[PDB]
Amino acid sequence: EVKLEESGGGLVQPGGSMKLSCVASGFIFSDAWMDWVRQSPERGLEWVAEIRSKANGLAPYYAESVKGRFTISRDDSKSSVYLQMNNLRSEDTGIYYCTSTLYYFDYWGQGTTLTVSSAKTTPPSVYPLAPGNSMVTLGCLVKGYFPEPVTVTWNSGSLSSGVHTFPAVLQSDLYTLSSSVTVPSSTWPSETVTCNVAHPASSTKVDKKIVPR
Amino acid sequence: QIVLTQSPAIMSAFPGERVTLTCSASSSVRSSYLCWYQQKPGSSPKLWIYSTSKLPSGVPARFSGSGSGTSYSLTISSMEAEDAASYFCHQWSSYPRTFGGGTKLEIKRADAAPTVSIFPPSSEQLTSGGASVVCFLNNFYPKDINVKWKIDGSERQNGVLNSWTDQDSKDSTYSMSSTLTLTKDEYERHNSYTCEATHKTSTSPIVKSFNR
């Protein structure tokens, strides 16, 4: 199957450097054109860079806002494409997607988040939300983290229906969100309900069990 | 650079209705290199229409595309719930490659009252020194809704942060979270806490409460 594994994201101070890596598998990497695209809340969806196949001349192209600071390169023998970034600015913050083009068909990776800020990495505080009918609602409050993102699952993903994870809001220069899950009363607290909160930038994970008050 | 304009940015459609999204280019785009991406929340954009009118595998047949020169369009012959998402047009005919601003396509459905749940500050947060009271307003329609707080009967308004989800994929409803942040002292000074939801087109509100 087609797969693009991305890495190298995280938090970096303004003026710093960072390299995004993308390992391709499941196709002839040397035949594909590789692209980097950025999606950010304030700059929408914008193409960043492109490098073409060896048979197409191996030419690189860059968006104007990154020309001179970003260098795209590819290693066919390792089926990898890289985006090296120098003199990173606040405008470069966003989710970067690695994409591969063969014929007209285009495949995108899951994307990794790059944050250019002077603020420091802060792990989140995860608090359970237990109530004080035929269905009950539980929650987890993820408060005071930086940077984006955090991922929230319930019971390692086995609890997928009735889950609402809300977008993060900015509070006191940190991020805060909540996740709610609605289950039948016959399942809790007779069986456990646990929220898995992951914050990759701080390499943190909290498995918070929702015990009744 | 070819600037792509998608107007309007938000569009709504009934189930089964024919829908058309437009993409206007500042200069001519070769039709072979005009494509459309679909993005649903929590997922990467997926190539939905390539070369103006061709569908990749997995894309339902009710989708089509057309256009030429500087004017293109994506069409859904019959709107379905799973078609509610963001749609971007995109050109790679002239570099730099450019995307449109995107269109959030939503589907209309029957009005629904929100399931409201209120949660007190947990003991773990009280140990640290803060106190956040949480209120979920889940699975309502339309998106317009108001929430208000009361502490021992007194109406509250400050220290409240709200967050909305996108339209759900199966029941086409919206959800909202309302968080009231206070100090441990202020929370300890009072006992009764109330979160109520009101839709302006209705009188009877949905009220939840607890006592410290």
Author numbering:
A (entry chain H): 1 to 132, 138 to 218
B (entry chain L): 0 to 211
Report text from the authors:
Polyethylene glycol (PEG) is a water-soluble, low immunogenic and biocompatible polymer formed by repeating units of ethylene glycol. In this regard, we have developed monoclonal antibodies that can bind specifically to PEG for universal detection and quantification of PEGylated drugs by anti-PEG sandwich enzyme-linked immunosorbent assay (ELISA). In this study, we determined the crystal structures of two PEG-specific Fab and one nonspecific Fab in complex with PEG.
Recently, by somatic hyper-mutation, the variant mAb 2B5/IgG obtained from the parental mAb 3.3/IgG displayed greater affinity for PEG at 4 °C, but the affinity was decreased at higher temperatures. The tetragonal crystal of the 2B5-Fab/PEG complex contains only one Fab in its asymmetric unit. Nevertheless, a similar pair of Fab with an S-shaped PEG wedged between them can be generated by crystallographic 2-fold symmetry operation. The 2B5 Fab has about 575 Å2 surface area buried, 405 Å2 on the heavy chain and 170 Å2 on the light chain, involving more than 9 and 6 residues, respectively. The 2B5-Fab/PEG crystal contained real crown ether. In addition to the K19(H) side chain, crown ether was also observed to bind to those of K210(H), K214(H), K103(L) and K142(L) by a similar mode, as seen in previous crown ether-containing crystal structures. In the 2B5 Fab dimer, the side chain of K53(L) from one Fab is not only in contact with the backbone of F27(H) and the side chain of I28(H) but also bound to a sulfate ion from the crystallization solution that in turn is bound to the backbone of G26(H) from the second Fab. Instead, the inhibition effect of crown ether on 2B5 is more likely a result of its binding to K53(L), preventing dimer formation, rather than directly blocking the PEG binding site.
